[PDB]
């Protein structure tokens, strides 16, 4: 599409998210979600092919259903208290409908099914935007009304999301489905700490976004969407594979990497509330994510796979487009554990 049109659509997506995050009226939050949905579809359908159209249709259906449920919860809450301000829910039925709608918007289990489908359908840039920027608004709304949420339902969905992400990522050879299931598991980790500390939710979101940005930019640079395609990257650009391996180590939560910071803190926070069993199950389940990250690391940099003859031609050329923020993203997603107490900045 026209670059001016693309810029306008991206700025409309961002303006919808900002309208969600700056408003105090439920109607304006709903309008921000609507604007974001409206401007998101062409971005997903930018590279026109039937797969992207199918993904855009699935995304539109799920997000429109979530918006309808959100409006239903808003109207019930208005019925039981003539309030439009985002604060308390004022009704058990309105809070359940609201949590369901926001979980469907985020992709939390049991509403996770659309995430791998849409992420596989769309390109790598659309998947980057979808898995990073589209979580800011529902999570901000959840952070605002967290004192209303029933901890049982939120914790159930968080544990389900962690389990589903772990088990579903084990079976994947496509990189985009791996990213989708990783996103699902990280959403589960984020929403399990909302009832206790929203600061830890925001910290986990920041760390996850940094790691996901680095991972997607590395995947775009070495333009591979398949495990075997990524196995060829060492014969052209081994440093990219090494950075990818260290980033995958960070994504698995292995200390002393950056990805260890959220889970640790989250576990720490949950122990202050006499919650012991659930963090233990969460860590043991995140071991599965680490396992399939290790499988990818084996396939990418730790061993050298067979190549093809035509690769020699690729040795003679350099990337025309380079990413300005990729080195900063790699360093931030790898080496910020010593700076952990800075989380008091209420990020």
């Amino acid at each position: 599409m026209n670059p001016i049109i693309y810029t306008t659509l991206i700025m409309t997506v961002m303006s919808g998210t900002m309208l969600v995050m700056i408003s105090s009226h439920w109607l304006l939050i709903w309008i921000g979600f609507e604007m974001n949905l409206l401007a998101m579809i062409p971005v997903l359908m930018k590279n026109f092919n039937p797969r992207a159209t199918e993904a855009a249709t699935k995304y539109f259906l799920t997000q429109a259903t979530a918006s309808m449920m959100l409006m239903m919860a808003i109207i019930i809450n208005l019925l039981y208290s003539g309030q439009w301000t985002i604060t308390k829910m004022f009704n058990p039925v309105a809070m359940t409908m609201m949590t369901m709608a926001l979980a469907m918007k985020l992709g939390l289990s049991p509403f996770h099914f659309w995430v791998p489908e849409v992420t596989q359908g769309i390109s790598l840039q659309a998947g980057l935007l979808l898995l990073t920027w589209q979580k800011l608004a529902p999570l901000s709304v959840l952070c605002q009304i967290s004192q209303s949420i029933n901890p049982n339902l939120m914790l159930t969905m968080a544990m389900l999301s962690i389990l589903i992400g772990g088990w579903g990522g084990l079976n994947q050879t496509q990189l985009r489905k791996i990213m989708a299931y990783s996103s699902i598991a990280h959403m589960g980790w984020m929403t399990a700490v909302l009832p206790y500390n929203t600061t830890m939710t925001i910290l986990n979101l920041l760390i996850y976004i940094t790691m996901t940005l680095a991972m997607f930019m590395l995947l775009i640079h070495s333009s591979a969407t398949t495990t075997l395609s990524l196995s060829h990257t060492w014969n052209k650009m081994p440093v990219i594979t090494s950075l990818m391996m260290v980033t995958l180590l960070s994504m698995g939560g292995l200390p002393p990497l950056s990805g260890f910071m959220p889970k640790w803190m989250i576990i720490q926070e949950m122990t202050k509330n006499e919650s012991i069993i659930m963090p233990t199950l969460m860590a043991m389940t995140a071991l599965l994510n680490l396992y399939f990250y290790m499988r990818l690391a084996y396939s990418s940099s730790l061993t050298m796979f067979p190549s093809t003859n035509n690769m020699k031609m690729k040795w003679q050329f350099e990337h025309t487009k380079q990413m300005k923020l990729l080195p900063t993203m790699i360093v931030l997603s790898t080496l910020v554990l010593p700076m952990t107490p800075a989380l008091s900045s209420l990020n």
Binding site: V93, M100, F113, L153, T156, W167, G168, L170, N171, Q172
Partner: protein
Amino acid sequence: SSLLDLIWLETILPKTTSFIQMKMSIMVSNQKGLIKLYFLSFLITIMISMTLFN
């Protein structure tokens, strides 16, 4: 050497874990991509959430 170290101590912790995780992964990931089944599951979990947490 063979009975305990190579077989049973191997069967208990690592092999059982691998088998369980493999079966769970094969169950969870195997969805035919039919959104009919997805939204039927959505309805079932919606009604369960309404009837279980309040």
